């Protein structure tokens, strides 16, 4: 940037924001991403100051512009979770966008933010009436996304399944045999929530996690379940089983149920695609050290799906 070293960041930000106003196509997103980088990473003390100017783009007619805004909310809240107090309303309104691609981006962003918000609640020295209400909002929005499992749109259902997966994992404890993604080592989980916390109740969250899992297990035996939603749910269960092996039981049961009752509406190539994913996920659970207790059942299913013995062995310890 010419004469950049002579500018204040704030001046540069205002210049770029006005530039972005001049531009009437998607290339304005490149400008707005430069603004994002400056007020989130270079100088986050400017984040509050410029928040309304970025958030104003949520009304832009461009799909990609509104998706950009959702991503910005995500980064802004990771930098400073207290901004959720003034951005949860916008994020929930964006969940409700007329365009499904904007909706889907909002679901992925909530899948990132819910656990950040819950950590904030767990860590908070003191908790305001506004911060309580903000948690009520996050939690009700999590509930709305769980309800999107009954959307009439296949892509929204797929995204809702992934949000639900993340919720089950967050609201259950890590254990000795949990296989934890590198990225996620420091994410909050149930076991990190003090039993005597003045506001967040361990027992309530435990029940919501179990109820979230039940909703997913019910969804999977729904007679009209699509090929993509069923393969998504199968992979979600395998992830859950590996990160939270106290539910491995529930996962193997779902897999046996699906294997004995394939949803009749799946077309021939859809049945094959699903069956291939069932086998993949069974092999994946078998490799997990906690699958000790389920190995005879897993092996039987795998032999039924035609897996050669040599392939089963290759996936054993």
């Amino acid at each position: 940037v010419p004469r950049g070293s002579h500018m204040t960041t704030s001046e540069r930000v205002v210049d770029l924001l006005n530039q972005a106003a001049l531009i009437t196509n998607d290339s304005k997103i490149t400008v707005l991403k430069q603004v994002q980088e400056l007020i989130i990473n270079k100088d986050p003390t400017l984040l509050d100051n410029f928040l309304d100017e970025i958030i104003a783009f949520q009304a832009d007619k461009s799909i990609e512009v509104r998706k950009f805004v959702i991503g910005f909310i995500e980064e802004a809240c990771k930098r400073d979770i207290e901004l959720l107090l003034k951005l949860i309303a916008n994020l929930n309104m964006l969940l409700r966008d007329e365009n499904v691609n904007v909706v889907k981006k909002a679901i992925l962003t909530m899948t990132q933010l819910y656990k950040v918000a819950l950590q904030w609640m767990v860590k908070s020295r003191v908790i305001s009436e506004l911060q309580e209400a903000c948690w009520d909002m996050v939690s009700a929005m999590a509930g709305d996304i769980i309800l999107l499992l009954d959307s009439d749109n296949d892509g929204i259902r797929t995204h809702a399944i992934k949000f639900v997966e993340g919720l089950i994992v967050t609201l259950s404890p890590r254990m000795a045999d949990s296989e934890i993604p590198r990225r996620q080592e420091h994410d909050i989980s149930l076991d990190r929530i003090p039993r005597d916390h003045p506001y967040i109740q361990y027992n309530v969250l435990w029940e919501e996690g179990k109820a979230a899992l039940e909703q997913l297990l019910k969804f999977m035996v729904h007679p009209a379940i699509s090929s993509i939603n069923l393969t998504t749910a199968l992979g979600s269960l395998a992830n859950i089983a590996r990160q939270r092996p106290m539910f491995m039981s529930e996962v193997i049961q779902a897999y046996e149920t699906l294997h004995a009752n394939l949803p009749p509406t799946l077309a021939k190539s859809q049945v094959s695609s699903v069956r291939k994913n069932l086998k993949l996920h069974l092999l994946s659970v078998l490799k997990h050290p906690a699958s000790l207790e389920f190995q005879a059942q897993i092996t039987t299913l795998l032999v039924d799906l035609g897996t050669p013995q040599a392939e089963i062995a290759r996936n054993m310890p």
Partner: protein, 189 residues
């Protein structure tokens, strides 16, 4: 629409598709999932074998000095020249880290290798990518017919309001019109 087209050697089926899609204004990359590169030889049981590091131009030259007349008559020198014109070397799917809306594979074995690999990368975003297979035989005429079929599918997809909601119905129409099966799954970034 950002598409990746994947074969075994990244020589023929995926490069024929790369070429048609590219010329028709799609954003497209191509890969192979095979362990090595295989090219036809003087008998069906004696293929030529190369490392994925080897350039199209180095293969061209190696084949030119082996049997100029054979590799002219079997279209391979022209194929390799065509490939050199798109990019310098075959690319292995397992070594790339790019984002697509749609990944098309040219046989079931390649589809299994794509799925196995993506399913083994840790998801960061949970953004889905749709993976669709069509069985295309590995020869020039099939590669060409398969490339046009893939181009027609991509064009259909360009044209739908809502890719994720309509793609299965579209694939079923394609199965019906082509008589070819289209496996379909999602993986997650």
């Amino acid at each position: 629409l950002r598409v990746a087209v994947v074969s075994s050697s990244n020589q023929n089926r995926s490069m024929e598709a790369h070429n048609i899609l590219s010329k028709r204004g799609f954003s497209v990359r191509s890969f192979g999932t095979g362990t090595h590169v295989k090219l036809p030889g003087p008998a069906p049981d004696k293929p030529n074998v190369y490392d994925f590091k080897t350039t199209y131009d180095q293969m061209y030259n190696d084949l030119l000095r082996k049997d100029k007349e054979l590799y002219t008559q079997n279209g391979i020198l022209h194929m390799l020249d065509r490939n050199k014109r798109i990019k310098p070397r075959p690319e292995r799917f397992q070594n790339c880290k790019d984002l697509f809306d749609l990944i098309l594979t040219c046989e079931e074995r390649v589809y299994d290798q794509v799925v196995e690999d993506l399913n083994s990368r840790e998801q960061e975003t949970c953004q889905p990518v749709h993976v669709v297979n069509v069985d295309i035989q590995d020869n020039h005429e099939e590669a060409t017919l398969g490339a046009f079929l893939i181009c027609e599918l991509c064009q259909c997809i360009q044209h739908t309001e809502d890719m994720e909601n309509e793609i299965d119905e579209l694939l079923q129409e394609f199965e019906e019109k082509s008589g070819r099966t289209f496996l379909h799954t999602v993986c997650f970034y």
